[PDB]
């Protein structure tokens, strides 16, 4: 085989891509799928909607792959990357779902979270798994399912409840599920680090963590934790257009994006833009527990003797949602490209600062009583000024998180790569370079997340020997944005932002 | 002979010592000499005040060595240890200095430093020589002397400029200067690793580095880089009371201190206390370039078919200067022992934390916009609480550097030896033991720096055969401080220190 495939199963879409030995994609196919919102704050997906979304993406890509004259016999292996924390529960016996998957943004577990935070044993969870208690981790999601869904209750007590993040589910069913010789139930170190069940330092399940949530190892079937790159642990695709092709790579989507940007050295960071932002910061071979509310997580675990690598993670809630706000809520323009144009139409922000704290501010600010607050409005303020401030808001929060990441880890920021969404805005990336004082790399190959899983698979099957080889091959209409602004003008702009953040505190009273 | 002599030429004093075969001094003589400070931030010494001082200690100590019944015939060899980075320039053909030596803390090179740091070239220096650009290394001091002192630039162009660190200067004159048959112009690997001229991995001058500073090796006379322990490369003392005694050892003072503590295995560290601290960390035969602003230097190069050993170095500005601050600035007490008594008169710090960032904080924090910040004051805070917080402040910063060295090198801390100044405070060292969680070793033999050079000369000439022999022979108030505190209580104290540090950054706005 000479090519590597990659399944990228996201929150709203699935895609399948096939890469060559240099990381460039030759065949691709994407599929939107249905998300379900039974009540406000609830968010679920049919596990079979996710799987068949993937099989229709494989089918579509390989028809295009076939039109170029290639066969499955040429795909050496595939990797999998997936939306993290999304929780699937199925019957160990029949491999059938016992409930809809609860997707990571679901908030039905709020009450449960407040309950678990009132424990005293909760004080020590951050240090053991790298994450604080919240509505996101798979643990609170699965505990809620057991305590509130009877068919899940029975299976747990009867000893036939199987748990998995989306990666585990996909690999299980792709191998054949219950109807299979050598059934495959596993998860890689990056996905398993998002559940709150795993010790971050040992990369093994921890009974202090399991016991805190009342989950019994010897009742529920937990996926076995394996490296993110392995030639055997994930098995092979049993059926379909890819029958007989081995699965050899598996990575959480935000980890896969960092791998796809070749952020393999301490201090190399990546920002993925969608409705919001996910930022990851390579910290090396020793995990770093945050003093600022950042998440400590696994960057990648490629094995073959090498030590696993960790990362710090931060997130912003409002990045592309800011543009959506300007277009729909305020009616500035009907397309995001015309929003950029309005921003480029003015020289600067006109003194406007948009603290886009629609649901408050998160790392590193942790301000829960502020709402969206717009400063600096005069009779001379125009839509372009506000559009600029909306872009800058994302860049200011990005610096705030990267600053925290430098302080948490002690490494100076070495590089910043960007992909997705708002990264297409030259103006926004240029502002990020200006505000942070660092080159901003934006690859032209836009499917960075999927490439990460392809690298993981290629490394397990000999397409690439080491990570130097990965960098060399990948390296081998604009790419890098370089700072233009005086560093003292940059601090001044950033200090105005922080003044506005402090002034936004205390809006919501009770 | 069975005895070994050691020249310890310090920043403000010279001393000559004679050690027996188990590392105990049998004769000593010390002389304070003249430093000079024409302009603020300038620091100079007459190269003959340094050598004359050395000669007077040799004379003074051999007069006492005679009272014991011994003479130069009983001294197998002598070694030399010295203030590092201090730059000496002299004329090749006459052997007379061209200008006063520039002591290492001189700051006249700052402008030139920011000149050379602006070049993209500078990024490659640290990985090349293990050091970043600063005002300390001899490179910028020599370049300044060439670019700004005509007597030196003229000797440079006329091909008779000779450069040397103090070690090289002393060995050259002791051997007889220019009139000597077989003139000796050399420097040991540890001293040469402080100039920024030497490749750290190869222990040879590097044209790439000499080029960066515009230094022509076919025009300037650089000292030959030799091992720290050699029975012939340093020659012999030409005249005086040690006429005929070979010189066979040479180490930078901080490196000599590590040797004198027998810090020979990876992970063994030492700390020397004065106005501040110099910490060294043995990392083994493979050099380690720091991610946290620490310096990569040579620990010792003992030759004899053994690979050289490297180390990581960190420095703290405020250790004894903190005690001095409490006495003079705040008037707590006229003597240091009373400051200590005040700290001992309370059970703990009373919640007080003193971030002693008088001119900011340095490795591994690197905070340039913080001043001294005292936290936790109530109407119950007394001098003793603030005295304790001052001592803990240097221990906290000490732990922060040792943690950074562990992470950089991969080697767990095996031990910590202390010497000088504040190490005499039983309380401070017990506090360090409590905070770091390991035993703290403090030799009753106080002259650890001078022992290092004696060890080098002894290994060169058979007094000690191997490094194991050294450890055994020198294994023969108080000596060892053991942790009297949980890791959990210690971690709480360190977290509040790090919180104080975080709350101190951002004080200076312009």
Residue numbers in the entry:
A (entry chain A), B (entry chain B): 65 to 540, 550 to 583
Paper text:
Here, we report the first structure of glycerol kinase from the thermophilic filamentous fungus Chaetomium thermophilum (CtGK). Glycerol kinase (EC 2.7.1.30) catalyzes the transfer of phosphate moiety from ATP to glycerol to form glycerol 3-phosphate (G3P). Overall, the CtGK polypeptide chain can be divided into two distinct domains classified by Pfam as FGGY_N (residues 65–325) and FGGY_C (residues 331–583) connected by a flexible region. A similar case is found in CtGK, which forms extended dimers via the interaction between the C-terminal domains with a prominent contribution from hydrophobic residues (Phe422, Gly436, Phe389, Leu394, Thr437, Phe439, Gly440, Ile441, Thr437, Thr445, Leu438, Ile450, Trp580).
We initially determined CtGK in an apo form using ethylene glycol as a cryoprotective agent. The asymmetric unit (ASU) contained two polypeptide chains. A similar organization was observed for the later structure obtained in P2221 (both chains modeled for the range 65–583 with a gap 541–549). The dimer interaction is mostly mediated by β-strands located on the C-terminal domains. Although crystals were grown from the same condition, the collected datasets were processed in different space groups. We observed that in the absence of nucleotide, CtGK adopts open conformation, which upon nucleotide binding closes up.
